[PDB]
């Protein structure tokens, strides 16, 4: 529609000449076309929430509106594609405006000026299934299946041969009418239909032993990493997605730092995938917002990504979404709800915070689509408070929605080891329900190991304090034996690198064997003090060193290295 | 001291900030509610120039 | 009734005049994009009626729009064919099962209940957790909230007791062939994981065998969470009294109740706050938890079992505080035994129940149930007490007449409190509770009568 | 007649238009259903109603009928066993008509006009009558009921019917002033029955609590708070406080009492003994209790019903017990009503006018001599509730603007299943020295003396408790540990008054004074015993410790057999040892 500005208070604009306006409608206020959005109408005028700040805008101008509700854009070009929280490409902004950004910028949301490949995976006279088959685009990532959106099962006519076609160019049209192009529009505030929501049963690799093998959340979890970034914690976040079994990674922040957040972007093409063997950048979607970015950019942040992962899901890809700075997301919302009638009433935050918080996790997880394909939307909830109070809205709300805290502590970080997971200050409520499927698919005694072995560390935590104040030397062999076994798990097993290639990428068939041997050494060590054996002898065994060499080898040498290492233990307490 | 600290002291020195906090915070409901009705007056006044 | 949108807020909005609208009414409101939803009409006015939006107001035009009265108050039907079917999401069962065919359309808002048509408990509920049912006394006359911790999850406990309650053959003098062992489960907020948690746990209770399992689906709009409480309730009152079957409504996290409720009063200006939670909270919870005792006349009854976490141990914040006052006594599980690897972890020392000699007595449970109640309570007490004072002076704080109460805090521990998920019988419980009471001097017992010393030693 | 209709509806409130000629506070039937509200705020000609019953199924435009006569409560014969609830109806009857459930919009008369009772004249024609005086007796159960002339009514007498049963609305005494003075009479709820001269209490109040009364009493006419944090003892101590009473009439207002509590309450009363008819306690109780299921304003109204009934019995010359259960009721009422009627809240959701009616309700109470010239007393025991769990809350600070007696129930004592839970560091009373005349006159001379002699014990226990938790008392000297274990028995067998054992459920002055001399003995002997080098260690093993412990193993009405008996062995068989 088309209307006229009446007021300008703040960044927000209010303008009459609106009538028959939709809710969450496309608004480009003024003759400057600032990216805005129609919201809550009032009278013959409307309230307009303009993301970009206004300061050149005068009242009484024309306001062009599309008259169609804002939707997320889904097409090719997204894999190996830089975008922000409004979803414009931040580098074609750099070329068309320069280093600096001058507001009222509108460009296409996807790379639509490229000629993208095509292959028809359907033909005319056949019927399509929603959420699946239309045609694929070969790319230099893997593939990208450009599929028709849900509830479109009709007959197709005119499917054109494999070649190169622009996103806006057609390759297919329907027999029953209603035309379609490679770009697809899906609603920002709605999620796609499913057939079952499944149960999680395929473990979610993270490529570092301790992280997933000890505390799994499997594929379709919801996790969290607390405490602010800058404690070397960012080590964890990059390497996570990097090693982890998937085929697409989506990285997203909102209210994240200055220059520290631009180190991440340039170092992102310098991260390298293990599967493809080339950069992670090939198969990564960015929609990050910095903090110079518009008001509601950060506030819309979340929702985008969610949707976008569901696209890749329907295709039959595994996605890995990384929700950085969940805590700072709330900043914007507070600001917006203040200037309206959604005023604070909880505790220093609006009470609609909890509502907008939930849905982000609710509408993600490992589920099966209409297209019949599987994929997961594992979320790892970096809250990152400045300190966090349990009587702060942010903390006591999140705490409930996620099932895991994969807590790292500061003491543990100074020690320069990743995994740095502080086991006593971590938990994951999943474990229970994951034991059936673990031994089904993975291996026999794998669950049996994990739950059993954790106790070492437990029965060490309270032990060391001030009871063993000078080591044990006045203590019994009972209590001595715990810290002999304690030595190998915390200097070999807890430690691992992420900047050596021999142990940055691990897998099950490697981790399992490591973990078995360290049980079997508690089992022959505690039996040693009933035979009459001192720890002096234990401290000179080549076995301790063999545990250290089983991670200074990779997964390929593991078979041979497992033979020798295993049988060595059995013949190194039958010598004692 | 250890024993004592983990009970009466430490979470007690916590609950003091917490109790304080919450009452400071809740006070500011009345602030906003009053300020609301203030707004209502102001607009009501400029709405008698142009109507009733 | 006139359509006239000249203000949009969060989940409330302008609708011009009113002529057939009432409080509690179901209206249907067409967005005009082919999407339709409902709502409740609150604040009914001949000026601007404001309609409670059920799901996204997106696509809402000012063009082709309608408000249409569907029913004048809230109502929805309840068939006699309810038991043994899973009712995932509101109303209709969506899990592959065909629609609900209702027989009697009555309200689901709630109907008042005479307080002189309420009779004291005369039946004991046998629950498979020894601990709770002895001291706390599980009966159909009290509503005991389960308060969990953070790292003690609410979910583990909730699954457990679902199936683990059975009703006596004659230890209560009431047949087990006069009522079934059937249950109803409510959701007042369940999320993604929590739903996937109770999956497997439902199938073992007998999800489609005999139970009625209302669920919010866990992806469905906020507002729904404040609909299913009072539905679960009213629905059950029909089948409960009239058809004469006893059911226990296993309600889970009231957290998500407050949460969702609070949004609404934040655009209609009832200004929620007490500590940042609705100050109108109790008001709504009044009807919802009202039916939770025993009626007179009709058999079978309705009993509430609230299940909710604590954000902090502190009983200051209204999440446990106001809930406390409302309900009849409390039972906490603390974190004091969670920390140790005990499962189920019940700590009775911060726990205090409303009745402990009602619904119990000689022949209404067991003759020594009534006796062994208060006994277990003061016995543990005098154990845990010592472990305070030991640090404070020397490395001890005990004699030899303290040392026996000492071992009773170990004895009550991993033997009794822990049990896994194994079902203990009301016999097995108190029976063996007298093998731990052999370690205390019988001449130092003052919370149990002497004639019972001679029955079981 | 005031004939509006509706204008807006705002939750359980309703606003109305067409309302002209409407006075502030009347009978307000809303819609055609007639739910019974109240006209509170009057802005313009738009009269804010506040409905005591739910507004589900109440449309706008429905005719609103208002009497223009004040809301009054029905007062007349048939009051005892009877129900007047919080909404002006009798539940006994509601139970039968409306079936298992109560259906809103139903109303009947508060006082059953179907009742009949005999009339005994005490007046004749050509008498001169004044307000509040007696016209006749009526025998209703074990109680005597009088027919109080309505206050402010005077004039001569035309006739007086001869004895016989009549309907309780027919005129029994026709005045020669042109007023057929009907058997029942209304008196508005706000209005309170006069008084000729105001007096102060001086008769004690026993309730069946040992320590409670003995350390911090309340007079017969007095007032006290019971603040109980975290859903502890408070809630059913009130049941155990109304369980037994010294006062003649028992008026129990649960003020929108939770339905799961009212259960055990209601049914207990027929099985409780009555000490003037040997049967149901209902022959001396009246239930002004209302259901919690109903909205907020049915729990405000309920308190105002109660008091004007209390007064009616106080004006006939009887000791009247009033027990308001939970200030959590009252708080919630005003908390929510404030939003509704567009009032401006002052602090924390509570209206500016919070201690307004609250104060005055407490005021009315007192032993006083009426304009009828009889002497009754309204005795109050309200149970205070902090919603937040501290007394810093506005609703609880107001309940501490009043004086007299206080009591403090703590969460921590309550766990140990020793109810009543009372703190010597947390209460004060001003009925200690007001009751001292009637102590050394009826009770005993050595009762103003013996009470002081228990206090000192537990005075020193506060001071020393501190020291105990910082360093054990085993490190300390003998005489420190002395009074500590005197103290044991002051809790073990004297702060545990079992509401499940009936020889502790009874308590009276004889059981008072008695066990007070037991304790006395032990104190004076042990202080001298240990100055002869004995340690409190050995004495715990001596039979003397057990012996004082007999207070819950001994009867009430076989008590003077065991009192004197064991008493002697204290001064005997411990100075031999």
UniProtKB/Swiss-Prot annotation, chain A:
<dbReference type="InterPro" id="IPR020003">
    <property type="entry name" value="ATPase_a/bsu_AS"/>
</dbReference>
<dbReference type="InterPro" id="IPR036121">
    <property type="entry name" value="ATPase_F1/V1/A1_a/bsu_N_sf"/>
</dbReference>
<dbReference type="GO" id="GO:0046933">
    <property type="term" value="F:proton-transporting ATP synthase activity, rotational mechanism"/>
</dbReference>
<comment type="similarity">
    <text>Belongs to the ATPase alpha/beta chains family.</text>
</comment>
<dbReference type="GO" id="GO:0005524">
    <property type="term" value="F:ATP binding"/>
</dbReference>
<dbReference type="InterPro" id="IPR055190">
    <property type="entry name" value="ATP-synt_VA_C"/>
</dbReference>
<dbReference type="Pfam" id="PF02874">
    <property type="entry name" value="ATP-synt_ab_N"/>
</dbReference>
<dbReference type="GO" id="GO:0045259">
    <property type="term" value="C:proton-transporting ATP synthase complex"/>
</dbReference>
<keyword id="KW-0547">Nucleotide-binding</keyword>
<keyword id="KW-0406">Ion transport</keyword>
<dbReference type="GO" id="GO:0046961">
    <property type="term" value="F:proton-transporting ATPase activity, rotational mechanism"/>
</dbReference>
<dbReference type="GO" id="GO:0042777">
    <property type="term" value="P:proton motive force-driven plasma membrane ATP synthesis"/>
</dbReference>
<dbReference type="InterPro" id="IPR023366">
    <property type="entry name" value="ATP_synth_asu-like_sf"/>
</dbReference>
<dbReference type="InterPro" id="IPR031686">
    <property type="entry name" value="ATP-synth_a_Xtn"/>
</dbReference>
<keyword id="KW-0067">ATP-binding</keyword>
From Swiss-Prot, chain B:
<comment type="function">
    <text>Produces ATP from ADP in the presence of a proton gradient across the membrane.</text>
</comment>
<comment type="similarity">
    <text>Belongs to the V-ATPase D subunit family.</text>
</comment>
<protein>
    <recommendedName>
        <fullName>V-type ATP synthase subunit D</fullName>
    </recommendedName>
</protein>
From Swiss-Prot, chain C:
<dbReference type="GO" id="GO:0005524">
    <property type="term" value="F:ATP binding"/>
</dbReference>
<dbReference type="GO" id="GO:0042777">
    <property type="term" value="P:proton motive force-driven plasma membrane ATP synthesis"/>
</dbReference>
<keyword id="KW-0813">Transport</keyword>
<dbReference type="InterPro" id="IPR055190">
    <property type="entry name" value="ATP-synt_VA_C"/>
</dbReference>
<dbReference type="InterPro" id="IPR027417">
    <property type="entry name" value="P-loop_NTPase"/>
</dbReference>
<dbReference type="InterPro" id="IPR000194">
    <property type="entry name" value="ATPase_F1/V1/A1_a/bsu_nucl-bd"/>
</dbReference>
<dbReference type="InterPro" id="IPR020003">
    <property type="entry name" value="ATPase_a/bsu_AS"/>
</dbReference>
<keyword id="KW-0406">Ion transport</keyword>
<dbReference type="Pfam" id="PF22919">
    <property type="entry name" value="ATP-synt_VA_C"/>
</dbReference>
<dbReference type="Pfam" id="PF00006">
    <property type="entry name" value="ATP-synt_ab"/>
</dbReference>
<keyword id="KW-0375">Hydrogen ion transport</keyword>
<dbReference type="InterPro" id="IPR004100">
    <property type="entry name" value="ATPase_F1/V1/A1_a/bsu_N"/>
</dbReference>
<comment type="similarity">
    <text>Belongs to the ATPase alpha/beta chains family.</text>
</comment>
<dbReference type="InterPro" id="IPR022879">
    <property type="entry name" value="V-ATPase_su_B/beta"/>
</dbReference>
<dbReference type="GO" id="GO:0046933">
    <property type="term" value="F:proton-transporting ATP synthase activity, rotational mechanism"/>
</dbReference>
